[PDB]
Symmetry: C3
Subunit: 228 residues, 3 copies
């Protein structure tokens, strides 16, 4: 099989979610955090032609940057990975499945309770400023006919009543009320425009961020509240 | 209120002199080191619309680099600060004036003993070489008809007798003799061309560095000597 | 003296092998690691007009990037070094020869047992990959009519049996068999194209990497075997 730079770039975003991964034959990739808070999946243009688990995905990807962009990769005689370059060969260890955490099946996200969206710059600003104001948690809520994202410092603001940041998304004429809480540490979303689908059913809350390139599913906090 | 790139640049310099600052209505800004060693002021093109003290100027400025050109800085209803545009709002704490140190009056330099100048590139060299030569002290003295700056490491050269760096400024057309000492740690001046005025009267010694953008007043060390 | 960007570039590589160095009059420079593993020499275009030992070559070189490219370097009246710039002077200490380690005479490499070569692009990959794969040892051997380099991690593969990398160098039709082991830590070779001269006689084994810019002599490990 071959890995293009586009695929490689998405795999690099995945490695920040889980340092390891299980690649399965097909044009599809997915991963899930060890703590189960963040899920990611994407359709790729490359065809994976063998199943193999990688313990250190990031270092593997970096190694691909050192060989021909069309380097052919396959499983070697010893069960490990072989990377065939023009005049050289790079062998990389194949991990035993038991040493990495991975999704056994893709996530089928429920029908959304509410849909909104965030633009590339807005997302970029939220991520940029969150780090500078120690925003460790955000809340997506309905306010004044709009869906808004408030950022807080859970540590010194245990009740999330003093926002240090606020971003307006889309208009909301709906009937329901909600305050979905997200741990900023799970927002490993790569830059881009996303359709945001929020879901709540009793004590179960989750969010899905979808772009033309990747889809993420992030679990929401227990202090979340909704009318649905 | 809006702060352009240049004003922000100058404020960043001021932030390195004193972590805090008091901003007052007008087109003028000034600050001073907590230990009173370095003073700086400048006239700016941006109009400050309200009085406000910032406890951590540097972090505040870095935050400004993340807002849009449409963002506008203003006093929020809670007495704190707000930086908002059409889509988002960043909140920042307005400090209690008593939690910071600031000049209640600008420092003037009515008279001088000797006047010289240092070009932007020479100031740049002095700053960079001192960093690599562990120079913590400089002396501006007259030698063979010229004004020169000698750099030393007082830590291993108590008498300041072994210069590690020497910079020639201008031809000295005077009859006096001097050796003004400046703690290099107080030379927190931004890059640029500066007119340098040195004043000495008995135990009192001070220097003024003036560029078209800002001007500083620096307290010189007791080690200094002169016959003015 | 005057040191061109080219000579400085070479000296920097030399500083990675031994922090100090001894400059002798002429247009030749050399150095050797304190542990004796690697030696390096070069003929430069700049004429060294006085002898001086440098305790910290790397810091010296960085200081030179702060002055004009044509600054004059010489022996000061105090026995130390003087670097004369257009409008300034930087002083640098001349080390006592007994505080640094240096070759007393250049290395006369024996006539080679086998000769091969490595392209700049291939050396670059070798060096880069080694870091990403934790390769601490390489072996240059004859395999299927060619000379190849295999990279290993000796900590987990002491018998050097499980190659993590392999690079094909040149065709080989000799009768001799050899497995020359080199410690990757000693491969502090600057980029370029090199003629590789391998030598073995009984338990003495050594390699020489030669380019038109620099020459390196590296001692090879005891694990090495050959039938020369």
């Amino acid at each position: 099989m071959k890995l293009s730079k586009d695929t490689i770039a998405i795999l690099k975003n995945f490695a920040s979610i889980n340092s390891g991964i299980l690649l399965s034959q097909g044009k599809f990739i997915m991963t899930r955090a060890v703590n189960g808070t963040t899920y990611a999946e994407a359709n790729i243009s490359d065809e994976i032609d063998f199943d193999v688990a990688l313990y250190d995905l990031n270092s593997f990807l970096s190694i691909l940057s050192l060989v021909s962009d069309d380097a052919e990769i396959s499983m070697h005689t010893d069960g490990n990975i072989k990377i065939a370059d023009t005049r050289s060969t790079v062998y990389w260890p194949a991990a035993d499945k038991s040493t990495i955490v991975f999704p056994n099946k893709p996530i089928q996200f429920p029908v959304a309770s509410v849909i909104t969206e965030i633009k590339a710059e807005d997302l970029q600003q939220l991520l940029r400023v969150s780090r500078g104001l120690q925003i460790d948690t955000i809340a997506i809520t309905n306010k004044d006919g709009k869906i808004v994202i408030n950022g807080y410092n859970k540590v010194e603001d245990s009740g999330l009543t003093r926002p240090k940041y606020s971003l307006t998304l889309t208009d909301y004429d709906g009937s329901n009320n909600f305050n979905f809480v997200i741990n900023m540490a799970n927002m490993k979303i790569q830059p881009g425009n996303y359709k945001v689908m929020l879901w709540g059913a009793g004590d179960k809350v989750a969010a899905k961020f979808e772009s033309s390139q990747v889809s993420y599913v992030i679990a929401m906090e227990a202090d979340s509240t909704h009318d649905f």
